[PDB]
Design a binder for these strands. Structure first.
Ligand SMILES: [Mg+2]
Ligand SMILES: [Zn+2]
Lengths: 96, 41, 653, 998, 133
RNA sequence: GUAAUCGCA
DNA sequence: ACAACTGCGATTAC
DNA sequence: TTGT
């Protein structure tokens, strides 16, 4: 319930949020380097991960809220989610 | 909000400049918050 | 649509000793400089007077009373006659004593000290800039050691070139005697230094460009084949790389921030304004007295003789630095340094950080004037905009307004007579109080303000009691039950605040919860029961009749008013069935069911009997009459809603 | 010998604890004192422990409470000092210090304050054998040994044998090395231990070994050992055995230990705390003796024993303990029930115990071991939920520090009956059945089945196999829960609320007993201590309001009564005579009736007619509509007494002077003052008057004024000269005002079944609904609370009360009356109502169509209501929380010295706080100007605030403040004291200029 | 209480300061993607602003920059509309602030969010308050 | 002015 | 090393 | 304590 809500929002681990999500994310991180080259691999991987994570992060929170009968609109959950998934981390290889 | 001394020392050593575009920023300063009637249009 | 551009930029940074000196330094008319704190004394013995050149000194900070001075002659600031700004005999200026609140001080330190935040935090900015390890710096600061070369921009005859000198056993007595003793003193700074000079010389004599260049070179070198190694070696390479990146970032920021790393080691320590640490006595001031005592003892030992033993002055330097650490931030090193009662001392970091710290307790949350709390009761005959307010609270909240009213009307000559009349509970005071708040909005609020509906606005109505009445339909919003709950009251003074309260924060403008946009104010417990009893229905089948009507409702009313009057006259019961004629509307919600029976006569008029209504028609397919079969409850609810709408529409005109 | 055939005394726990303390703890502590010998000649002083004699207090309790003095006893012990030069030992008796004494009620008097010592529940020393499953692999098993000081000698086992102690911070430690250091030669170790193959295959000190007697016993129990009780030390055999069990746990031969079991916990009583305080005082005394001997050697004088010892350590130690210890709290005397329920509390939180945050969830739940020993429905609501609990009625504290409960033994024997206080661990290995035996199925009665308890489980077994039986009705509850009639028909959740609300009742001016009760009010009033019980048989020759004279066996004893005193919670205490002149009274009977007690039974409320129906919204949520009869007949009138005192503190410059003639004050005040600067007795005062007038030279006017809400008669004033402080002390002037409070809108009322409400309207009797009798109901309650909070026993109570009032009967019913049959409460209630209806021919009381419900009329219109309503006379209490106390209002009066925000507290005339959760709502609504005004000029902006009054009086518009509030300026000053700058630096968009705001 | 506090902080800054940001992208909401719950689909569509026109043959049911309502959702589920492009705080062109069209209908009254409203705080409270249940 | 302790909803 | 509900009110102890 |  509420502990599960806290858990998803503070994304301690991606395995906690979902195993399929972590599997797909690591699969994209591994495979997307091969195809689409350097400039159009990172961008498309970031977009795909953003879409999948947002969809997942919402569906989970909305299911947790609806299991108890609490009806909330997805817009409020979206504003918060965007902030979670709005930043990117530069890898250690690139320094300029 | 959680680690006051750490972020204060970091901003002091860096020399950060904050533009008060947030609510709590004007709350601490004691001014008109740029929300609702405080938003000039 | 050019927007209104407001530009405000708060700025934070490390301050030079010159600025912390200029925060306190002032030039008296005689020509002396004030601001230095040099004596641990706060107040005189059994005189309760500020001691001179002390923590509460009048000369360096300001006078303790408005217009009075320590010399004993009162003066008036801003008078037409020429008056000296400060007494010649006594340094204290003639000014309002608000300065003690905003005036700072500074203690000159003979031996420099190091800031706890930069040094003893797990990310050490000093250890980051100076590639020397953190343990080496912590030793050189706290445990008597020596650094061989602290200056890299001056000539150095000695070729020690060592990082940490664990002992002074190296030959130095033959070296000092050989050179002139004054000469040895002159170059020892470029030579091995100890305690707090090596750190300052390293931070001062440093080239950030060379630092970023060397760090970039070392970063380019590392990472070639470190990942191929074991997890331990890869981890070490990664940590080193992260340290190098942090060093590059720190140096790049230091290049273009008009801030110098020299300011991390504090030459002079500022002193808080006296009023902010008022003595009852505070720990702040206890730590201040301790550091003042240790610093003056160190200065005495230094000025006594150069032949003094190095061990004593070094131990006193360590004591001064530990006192500075306990004053600035205690608990980072892990030593509590308890008081005489085995209680830990509070520090400035403990003052700012915490729930009970400066920020959360003061800036983001505060109490206001014009406020009152009381228990809440139901007022079931109030409107959504009106709330019951007790008079003993209103007289205190609107006291200034009723004073103005008593002054305006020929009832009170001055503020004192008006206040006395208000205290005497005269009858005209209550009339003026009523006339005052007829158009003033009251802001009620609750302690568990979870949602945005915790604070609303109502129109206060004067009541004779001590319990704040509240409308029943508005309870859900406040999560309020009358089992002992209490609420607060707030009065908007400014006209803009009054307009905001009257327009935005009223109940009639907030009827939908901001979660899913659903009605938040609805009949809940007793009104729902009444409505359910009204619209429940009647016994239809075996309950109403004992035998089948096959072997064998009655009242017919043309208007709803007639049926309601008959119910008031007890002619018909609440659930008693009846027939009501309708004027060709067909708005009754019912099931899609065909007529149970249809009677068709020769002349052409056919009667269509439905489940809940009868519709008589003629040969011309014309609906002659419609009769609805219902009870007084449904028609009463329909009539009350329709009459509410119609009365609203009529009252609008 | 006692408590096995009747309900024991509620205060017997503190009584026996203080008795055991005085009996043995003082001598045990005096035995361990060392021989003071600190010199080269080794001049040695000694205290003859055998000559230990306490002395009676010099003053009485009624003088200690009046003069604010401690009630203690004098400890005199003969001492012998052998001087170096004299070569002889002179023997004299010395006054070590004062030891506080406990009253018969369990309370102690220290500095004129009544204080109680709450018990603490602490884990017993022993070996615990917990287990923990690893993330990958087999589960790790660990054994912890707990010492009295709190040592933790852990032992762990990995996937291998790996018998590693966790004492060291490092990875591990060798158990064989520890055994060899203990003294084992590595041969007898393997010879003695079982499964030696596992041990051989694998290839500070005083506090850890400071096991208590309890520790020794427990160690012996878990690990079968034959070590004598006396040898309370961690022997290596114990360690060896521990290791053996640990290895055995790996192969399945073991059982882990439950650390929530009572048998694994000890209870610390007042004796345990007083013994440690006396030990600390003895240590301080030995230090002082060494110091004074060192000083006498410096002064070249051989002094008498009296010169060495000073009475300071004992007195200051006991005073500091009673003042600052977390387990020494002031007695709650709101009502007689609070005095008894306060001393039964057992607390987990305390010195050496789990803090609120530290406590795990497991700690706060009922363990089957708590049955009959601890209350499962009495806790403290808040962050400390499940950590503060009460003690069962029939419980006792055992020899080994364990709570014990009385269990009947149905097993056949010579006596065939026994009442044994089995300890927590012993009752587990017994078949305890709480059911009755009234069942026959054509077979022998012993073949019947009954639910029972075994091995902390529930099961159904034959009557042949049940060893024990729990007969006592009040065995599993406490005083608070047991005072709830028909508790079976109420939810367990509401029971805690009712127990908490019974504590809040206010003693009324008049007292009336309850028609329906549980029968525990008698012993509650007996043990409360607010009752006059004779201590001698005789006849009452003289009866007076102030004193009662009892003449017996040729001796006359005088008992002083209490006339309108004041409690700690501003509640009046008064006593009235019950026995008339000329009747005989035994040793134990009631002579007089105290407050909230009539006829010898606890009476915290009144019996009023009640109807359960909605009335025009006045009952919405919980709210009560009451009639004016309760007002003009003084049904719920109460007296409250509040004290105000200001000391005449003598400053170094000048002492305070108390004068009546003080200038700069209006002539409307000072009328009440006498020639001396004090108010006169019998003077009515109000808010803003002067009670004590002082010149205060150091002149000024530090007087005493009345705050908002204080309007009462001045009953008595006390001039208290303070002495015994080693110097002249300031005099204390204490005034007392009595405020008669009637029932008003906003007051809280409650019922014993968890029903609580706030009065909302006082309608006249003519508007109130009336029965078919013609009488208007006193209160109307909301009928929708019953399905919500699940309180069904209230209905029963109401009905039985109506029946009793009509038939003039009082019903004392023990809980769980359904053990006799089914619907026993319903049968009883309906039977009594019928009888009432027949005897007084009021047919309405029992309606055959709807039993318990009648049809009432409306007072306004006179028309009957459609559906029948419940009519009864429950017991309603008036709670302490009252509207007058909660009313508050501030305009602009006072500010804090440093923050400059308005002050906090109702007495200090402070405003309300706008927290972060309210700033968020204000920002969500969009009211920026309201937030700005509240954050600047209603709170902290000195200039703006000064200008606000002028602008409001003149009528001009209030300008928007532009300067920073004092809170921000403070921050800047603080941060710049921390060498951090902060500047506003606003930039103009017009001309691109930076302007600093200071 | 703790959960309600943290959330507010993260999203405190957001406030509606623009009528439109100019984004041409929108999320596609389709029933068959998530097992097709009708009530959930209706709750998702209601309150959002369309980012692309919906065509059923030559006729256009709803154009761009239009606020979906219960009637529009019923028409869509009746005509069996294909994945619909709507505006959302995700497709906004800024992270410090959003616009009226990206947010959509206001929960308070039932129209576009007016400039100056702080929706960040509102969302935090609307998520925290039902957390008790 | 700070603590300790209890209560409140 | 860091944080773990919101406030209010009462008392005694410094 | 509990987890970070
Ligand atoms: Mg409530
Ligand atoms: Zn029963």
């Amino acid at each position: 319930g509420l502990p599960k809500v806290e858990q998803v929002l503070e994304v301690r681990s991606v395995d906690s949020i979902s195993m399929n999500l972590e599997k797909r994310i690591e699969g994209w991180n591994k495979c997307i380097t091969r195809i689409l080259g350097i400039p159009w691999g990172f961008l498309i991987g970031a977009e795909l991960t953003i879409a999948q994570s947002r969809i997942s992060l919402v569906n989970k929170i909305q299911q947790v809220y609806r299991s108890q009968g609490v009806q909330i609109h997805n817009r409020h959950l979206e504003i918060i989610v965007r902030q979670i998934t709005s930043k990117v981390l530069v890898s250690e290889d690139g320094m300029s | 909000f959680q680690e006051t001394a750490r972020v204060l020392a970091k901003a002091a050593l860096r020399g950060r400049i904050d533009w008060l575009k947030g609510l709590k920023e004007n709350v601490v300063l004691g001014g008109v918050i740029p929300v609702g009637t405080g938003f000039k249009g | 649509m050019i927007d209104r551009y407001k530009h405000q930029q708060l700025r934070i940074g490390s301050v030079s000793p010159q600025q912390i000196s200029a925060w306190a330094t002032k030039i008296l008319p005689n020509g002396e400089i004030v601001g230095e704190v040099t004596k641990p004394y706060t107040f005189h013995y059994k005189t309760n007077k500020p001691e001179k050149d002390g923590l509460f000194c009048e000369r360096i900070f300001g006078p303790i009373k408005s217009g009075i001075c320590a010399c004993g002659n009162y003066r008036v600031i801003g008078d037409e006659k020429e008056d000296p700004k400060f007494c010649e005999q006594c340094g204290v200026e003639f000014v309002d004593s608000r300065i003690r609140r905003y005036q700072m001080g500074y203690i000159k330190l003979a031996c420099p000290v190091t800031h706890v935040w930069y040094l003893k935090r797990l990310p050490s900015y000093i250890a980051n800039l100076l590639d020397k390890p953190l343990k080496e710096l912590e030793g050189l600061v706290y445990c008597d050691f020596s650094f061989a070369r602290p200056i890299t921009k001056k000539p150095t005859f000695l070729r020690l070139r060592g990082l940490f000198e664990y002992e002074i056993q190296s030959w130095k007595y033959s070296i000092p005697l050989f050179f002139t003793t004054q000469g040895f003193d002159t170059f020892r700074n470029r030579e091995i230094s100890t305690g707090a000079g090596a750190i300052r010389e390293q931070l001062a004599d440093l080239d950030l460009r060379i630092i970023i260049e060397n760090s970039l070179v070392e970063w380019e070198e590392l990472g070639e084949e470190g990942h191929t190694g074991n997890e331990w070696e890869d981890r070490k390479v990664g940590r080193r790389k992260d340290f190098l990146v942090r060093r590059v970032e720190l140096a790049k920021h230091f290049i273009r921030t008009n801030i110098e790393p020299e300011w991390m080691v504090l030459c002079l320590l500022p002193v808080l304004p006296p009023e902010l640490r008022p003595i009852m006595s505070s720990d702040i001031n206890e730590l201040y007295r301790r550091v003042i005592y240790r610093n003056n003892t160190l200065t005495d030992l230094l000025t006594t003789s150069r032949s003094t033993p190095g061990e004593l002055v070094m131990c006193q330097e360590k004591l001064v630095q530990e006192a500075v650490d306990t004053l600035l931030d205690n608990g980072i090193r892990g030593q509590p340094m308890r008081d005489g009662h085995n209680k830990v001392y509070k520090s400035f970091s403990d003052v700012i950080e915490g729930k009970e710290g400066r920020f959360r307790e003061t800036l983001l949350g505060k109490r206001v004037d014009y406020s009152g709390r009381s228990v809440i009761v139901v007022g079931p005959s109030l409107s959504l905009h009106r709330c019951g307010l007790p008079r003993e609270i209103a007289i205190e909240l609107f006291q200034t307004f009723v004073i103005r009213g008593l002054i305006r009307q020929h009832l009170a000559s001055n503020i004192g007579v008006a206040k006395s009349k208000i205290r005497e509970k005269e009858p005209i005071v209550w009339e003026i109080l009523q006339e005052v708040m007829q158009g003033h909005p009251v802001l009620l609020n609750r302690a568990p303000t979870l949602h945005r509906l915790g604070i609303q606005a109502f129109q206060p109505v004067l009541v004779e009691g001590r319990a704040i009445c509240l409308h029943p339909l508005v309870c859900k919003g406040f999560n309020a039950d009358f089992d002992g709950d209490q609420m607060a009251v707030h009065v908007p003074l400014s006209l803009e605040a009054q307009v905001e309260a009257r327009l935005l924060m009223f109940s009639h403008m907030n009827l939908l919860s901001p979660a899913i946009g659903d009605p938040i104010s609805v009949p809940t417990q007793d009104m729902l029961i009444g409505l359910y009893v009204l619209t429940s229905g009647n016994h239809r089948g075996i309950c109403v009749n004992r035998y089948n009507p096959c072997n064998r409702k009655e009242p017919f009313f043309s208007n709803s008013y007639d049926a309601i009057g008959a119910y008031r006259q007890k002619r018909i019961n609440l659930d008693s069935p009846l027939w009501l004629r309708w004027r060709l509307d067909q708005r009754v919600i019912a099931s899609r069911e065909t007529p149970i029976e249809v009677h068709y006569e020769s002349l052409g008029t056919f009667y269509e009997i439905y489940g809940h209504y009868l519709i008589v028609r003629s040969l011309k397919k014309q609906i002659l009459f419609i009769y609805i079969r219902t009870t007084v409850g449904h028609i009463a609810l329909y009539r009350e809603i329709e009459e509410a709408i119609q009365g609203f529409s009529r009252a609008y005109s | 010998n006692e408590g096995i055939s009747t309900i024991p005394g509620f205060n017997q726990i503190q009584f026996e604890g203080f008795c055991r303390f005085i009996d043995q703890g003082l001598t045990e502590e005096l035995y361990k004192f060392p021989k003071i010998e600190d010199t080269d000649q080794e001049i040695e002083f000694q205290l003859f422990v055998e000559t230990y004699q306490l002395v009676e207090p010099l003053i009485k309790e009624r003088d200690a409470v009046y003069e604010s003095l401690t009630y203690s006893s004098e400890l005199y012990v003969s001492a012998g000092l052998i001087w170096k030069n004299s070569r002889d030992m002179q023997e004299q008796t010395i006054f070590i210090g004062n030891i506080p004494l406990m009253n018969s009620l369990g309370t102690s008097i220290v500095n004129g304050i009544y204080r109680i010592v709450i018990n603490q529940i602490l884990q017993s020393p022993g070996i615990y054998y917990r287990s923990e499953l690893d993330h990958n692999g087999i589960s790790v098993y660990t054994g912890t040994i707990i010492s009295d000081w709190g040592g933790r000698s852990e032992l762990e086992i990995d996937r291998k044998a790996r018998i590693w102690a966790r004492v060291s911070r490092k990875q591990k430690i060798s158990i064989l090395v520890l055994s060899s250091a203990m003294g084992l030669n590595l041969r007898e170790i393997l010879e003695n231990v079982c499964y030696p193959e596992i041990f051989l295959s694998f290839l500070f000190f005083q506090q850890r070994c400071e096991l208590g007697r309890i520790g020794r016993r427990n160690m012996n129990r878990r690990l079968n050992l034959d070590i004598p009780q006396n040898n309370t030390f961690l022997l290596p055999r114990d360690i060896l055995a521990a290791a053996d069990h640990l290895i055995g746990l790996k192969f399945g031969m073991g059982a882990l230990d439950d650390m929530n079991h009572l048998k694994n916990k000890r209870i610390r009583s007042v004796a345990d705390l007083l013994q440690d305080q006396f030990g600390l005082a003895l240590v301080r005394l030995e230090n002082v003796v060494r110091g004074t001997i060192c000083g006498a050697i410096r002064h070249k004088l051989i002094p008498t024993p009296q010169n060495l010892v000073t009475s300071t350590p004992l007195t200051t130690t006991y005073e500091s303990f009673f003042g600052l210890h977390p387990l020494s709290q002031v007695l709650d005397r709101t009502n007689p029930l609070t005095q008894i329920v306060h001393g039964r509390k057992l607390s987990y939180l305390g010195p050496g115990g789990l803090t609120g945050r530290t406590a795990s969830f497991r700690i706060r739940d009922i363990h089957p071991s708590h049955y009959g020993r601890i209350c499962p429905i009495d806790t403290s609501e808040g962050i400390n939920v499940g950590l503060i609990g009460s003690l069962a009625i029939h419980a006792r504290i055992g020899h080994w520090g364990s709570l014990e409960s009385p269990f009947y033994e149905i097993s056949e024997r010579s006596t065939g009956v026994r009442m044994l206080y089995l300890s927590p661990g012993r009752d587990e290995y017994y078949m305890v059945a709480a059911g009755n035996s009234l069942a026959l199925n054509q077979d022998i009665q012993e073949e019947q089945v009954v639910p029972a308890r075994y091995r902390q489980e529930f099961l159904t077994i034959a009557w042949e196999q049940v060893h024990l039986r729990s007969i006592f009705p009040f065995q599993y509850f406490s005083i608070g829960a047991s005072l709830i009639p028909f508790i079976e028909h109420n939810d367990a959740n509401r029971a805690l609320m009712s127990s908490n609300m019974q504590r809040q009742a206010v003693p009324l001016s008049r007292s009336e007993k309850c028609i329906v009760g549980t029968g525990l009010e008698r012993q509650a009033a007996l043990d409360s201590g607010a009752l006059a019980i004779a201590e001698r048989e005789g006849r009452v020759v003289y009866t007076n309001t102030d004193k009662i004279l009892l003449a017996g066996n040729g001796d006359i004893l005088s008992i002083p009564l209490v006339i309108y005193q004041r409690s700690n919670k501003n509640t009046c205490m008064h006593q009235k005579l019950q026995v008339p002149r000329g009747k005989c009274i035994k040793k134990g009977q009631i002579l007089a009736d105290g407050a909230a007690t009539v006829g010898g039974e606890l009476a915290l409320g009144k019996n009023v007619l009640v109807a359960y129906m909605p009335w025009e919204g006045y009952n919405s949520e919980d709210a009560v509509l009451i009639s004016e009869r309760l007002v003009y007949e003084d049904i719920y009138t109460s007296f409250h007494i509040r004290k105000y005192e200001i000391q005449t503190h003598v400053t170094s410059q000048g002492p305070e002077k108390v004068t009546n003639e003080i200038p700069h004050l209006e002539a409307h005040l000072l009328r009440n003052l006498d020639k001396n600067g004090i108010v006169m007795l019998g003077s009515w005062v109000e808010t803003g008057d002067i009670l004590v007038g002082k010149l205060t030279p150091q002149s000024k006017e530090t007087c005493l004024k009345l705050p908002i809400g204080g309007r009462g008669r001045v009953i008595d004033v006390r001039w208290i000269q303070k002495r015994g402080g080693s110097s002249y002390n300031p005099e204390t002037i204490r005034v007392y005002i009595l405020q008669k409070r009637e029932i008003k809108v906003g007051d809280k009322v409650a019922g014993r079944h968890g029903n609580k409400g706030i009065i909302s309207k006082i309608l006249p009797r003519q508007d109130m609904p009336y029965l078919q009798d013609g009488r208007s109901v006193d209160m109307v309650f909301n009928p929708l609370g019953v399905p919500s909070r699940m309180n069904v026993g209230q209905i029963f109570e109401c009905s039985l009360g109506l029946a009793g009032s009509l038939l003039d009967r009082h019903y004392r019913i023990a809980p769980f009356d359904e053990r006799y049959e089914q619907e026993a409460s319903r049968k009883l209630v309906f039977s009594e109502l019928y009888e009432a209806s027949k005897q007084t021919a009021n047919p309405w009381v029992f309606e055959p169509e709807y039993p318990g419900k009648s049809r009432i009329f409306d007072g306004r219109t006179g028309n009957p209501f459609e559906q029948p309503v419940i009519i009864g006379k429950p017991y309603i209490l008036k709670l302490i929380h009252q509207v007058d106390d909660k009313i508050h209002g501030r305009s602009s009066g006072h500010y804090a010295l440093v923050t400059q925000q308005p002050l906090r507290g109702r007495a200090k005339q402070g405003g309300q706080r706008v927290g972060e959760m309210e700033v968020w709502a204000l920002e969500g609504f969009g009211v920026a100007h309201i937030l700005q005004e509240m954050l600047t000029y209603k709170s902290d902006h000195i200039r703006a605030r000064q200008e606000v009054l002028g602008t409001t009086i003149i009528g001009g518009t209030i300008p928007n403040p532009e300067d920073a509030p004092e809170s921000f300026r403070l921050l800047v000053r603080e941060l710049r004291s921390l060498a951090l700058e902060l500047n506003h630096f606003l930039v103009s968009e017009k001309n691109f200029q930076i302007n600093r705001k200071e | 209480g703790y959960l309600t506090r943290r959330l507010v902080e993260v999203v405190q800054h957001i406030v509606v300061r623009r009528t439109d940001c100019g984004t041409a992208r929108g999320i596609s909401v389709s029933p068959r993607n998530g097992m097709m719950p009708e009530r959930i689909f209706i709750q998702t569509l209601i309150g959002r602003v369309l980012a692309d026109d919906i065509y059923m043959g030559p006729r256009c049911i709803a154009t761009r920059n239009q606020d979906i309502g219960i009637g529009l959702v019923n028409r869509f589920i009746t005509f069996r509309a294909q994945p619909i492009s709507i505006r959302t705080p995700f497709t906004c062109r800024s992270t410090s602030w959003i616009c009226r069209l990206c947010y959509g209908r206001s929960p308070t009254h039932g129209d576009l969010v007016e400039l100056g409203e702080a929706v960040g705080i509102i969302a935090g409270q609307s998520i925290g308050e039902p957390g008790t249940q």
